[PDB]
Design a protein around this ligand. Sequence first.
Ligand SMILES: Cc1nc(-c2ccc(C(F)(F)F)cc2)sc1C(=O)NCc1ccc(OC(C)(C)C(=O)O)cc1
Lengths: 12, 267
Amino acid sequence: ARHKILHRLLQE
Amino acid sequence: DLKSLAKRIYEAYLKNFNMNKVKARVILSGKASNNPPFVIHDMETLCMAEKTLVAKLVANGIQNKEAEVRIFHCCQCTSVETVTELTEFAKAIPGFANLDLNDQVTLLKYGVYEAIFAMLSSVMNKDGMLVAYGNGFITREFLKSLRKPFCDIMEPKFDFAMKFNALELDDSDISLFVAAIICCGDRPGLLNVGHIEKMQEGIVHVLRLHLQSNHPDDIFLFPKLLQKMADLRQLVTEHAQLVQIIKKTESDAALHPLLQEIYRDMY
Ligand SMILES: Cc1nc(-c2ccc(C(F)(F)F)cc2)sc1C(=O)NCc1ccc(OC(C)(C)C(=O)O)cc1
């Protein structure tokens, strides 16, 4: 997906 | 809300960044120290520093890779950690977590490098910068001696940092400046522009007031900082251009996944 890592970091 | 918004953002900043200006200045003071930072001023000292600070880079054939590639790798690891800290800092800025996830992603995507270059100033002086969590100091001249395009990365940042440091800001000032950089309403692709503009307005409001009481003798400090925000955007656009060139021409300079995400379709 687009920005997989940023999305993950933001949701923790 | 606004009365102590500055203090809160400052607390979030002190809580999320392992390195800040007060810590960096102590290390760079030259005062008596039991563990002074290791200076990297040439190929010989670079290898020595790697042996102690990032041992993996002196073994497994990695020591046979160009110095430039090893340094670039360390730059990437450093940026990844800083982006990670900025993301936690952003989540602590009042209102940021309430934004749609896409807008949160967009603000960080376009704002992290402006914040990174602004914060680099904190660990730099005219001769070089602290690295490896304050344990090393790489010289400006050594970086300039590297082969292109690697030697073209840091100069603009050192130049920006010298003029930025001339403002004599402290961490309380910087924390507000970084929050303002992140909560920017005109980033491309934002959905709730109005909501974000409101956040920025409040941050800028407390920043203006903070500069008045913390820096009484410089009545132009606020507009000076506004210009720095514009200078940073330009600095990032030019940096992205260079990063793309390195990506297409350097075989062993592939970007870390997180950095690739950030630069993908940025400018
Ligand atoms: C110049 C420098 N040297 C380091 C260093 C650290 C440790 C060691 C040691 F060997 F371990 F000591 C040597 C050098 S870490 C570092 C640095 O982070 N400078 C700022 C910088 C450089 C390059 C950037 O571009 C990339 C593509 C990475 C990006 O946009 O993210 C950005 C920012």
